[PDB]
Point group: C2
Chain length 193, copies 2
């Protein structure tokens, strides 16, 4: 009843924030899209920053559930790492929108401590996932010996950089090109020769 009103507001706000930008989304844009009042929205989220914070929290959870679903039947660490990286591509739809929002979060983080803390915890979880995957492939003998933390740092960084090049329209860049670049890095920098 009320938890349902919240989720709908957040789902709508996420999409609007992704496609129009957080500072260009007004409360009445959300209320119009859903048929509610500005007052209902204010009741659940007294400030716009609260809509962003709670929308991010909901999405980090959705995204992690997606990850769990995609990987649970995968035991080979190369296949796991390949899938993990695939889940990070800004493919058409929800993943492209998530990227759109994360780019905004990088900036808003430099200014809002709750957003900064949420982004860091979400980042850290991913970072540990990557590092853990590396150490499994190392134990399985399919990945080269190398410090997994430095490698998780590098892979994560490479991914974010490439995504920017996709979103900002760098000439020759596409999701297929990013995919190819990242698969080349895995095959030549991570996989055991």
């Amino acid at each position: 009843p009320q938890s349902e009103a919240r989720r709908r507001i957040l789902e709508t706000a996420w999409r609007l924030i992704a496609r129009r930008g957080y500072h260009n989304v007004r409360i009445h844009d959300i209320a119009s899209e859903l048929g509610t009042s500005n007052a209902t929205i204010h009741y659940h989220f007294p400030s716009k920053k609260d809509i962003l914070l709670e929308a991010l929290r909901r999405n980090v959870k959705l995204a992690f559930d997606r990850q769990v679903a995609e990987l649970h039947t995968i035991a080979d660490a190369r296949e796991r790492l390949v899938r993990l990286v695939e889940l990070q591509l800004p493919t058409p739809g929800l993943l492209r929108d998530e990227w759109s929002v994360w780019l905004q979060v990088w900036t808003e983080s430099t200014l809002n401590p709750k957003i900064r803390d949420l982004y860091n915890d979400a980042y850290d979880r991913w970072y540990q996932t990557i590092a853990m995957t590396i150490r499994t492939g190392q134990k399985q003998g399919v990945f080269r010996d190398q410090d997994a933390d430095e490698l998780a740092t590098r892979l994560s960084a490479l991914i974010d950089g490439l995504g920017i090049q996709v979103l900002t329209g760098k000439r020759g860049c596409s999701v297929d090109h990013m995919r190819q670049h990242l698969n080349d890095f895995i095959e030549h920098n991570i996989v055991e020769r």
Copy 2:
């Protein structure tokens, strides 16, 4: 009057870097300088014109800075390490520049004049890195691996690490980013 626009842009640049473009109202610029929203619009008809002219000014200053630093350097390995050092978000001017760039990546995905400006700027920088790699390959100090893909890799790595710095990743610092990049150059670019 060339002096009034100058002050406006330098002030707007600093406020955008520190407060964020969407949080800077026109009266905020006026108060930092002592003037009115009207005078500000007199020189910049829209808020978006302020961001655009400021960015143009910055891109130029940064390219100048780069030419001054690379001027004499013949050795490609040294040129490359210097190019990379210029991208570090060191406290003060460079960190402020990164802050604006971060906003520009987002505004690019929505505004064409800004996307155009960012792509011409990024392409210049990217070709520079490419060129330098090819130089070191010819001099014999760098591994003969496709320079476009290496430059794509190094540029992406730079952006990603900068983000980790600016957003506060645990254990991240400007010096750690420097070491990571130098290690990338030394172990991935330089010829064993």
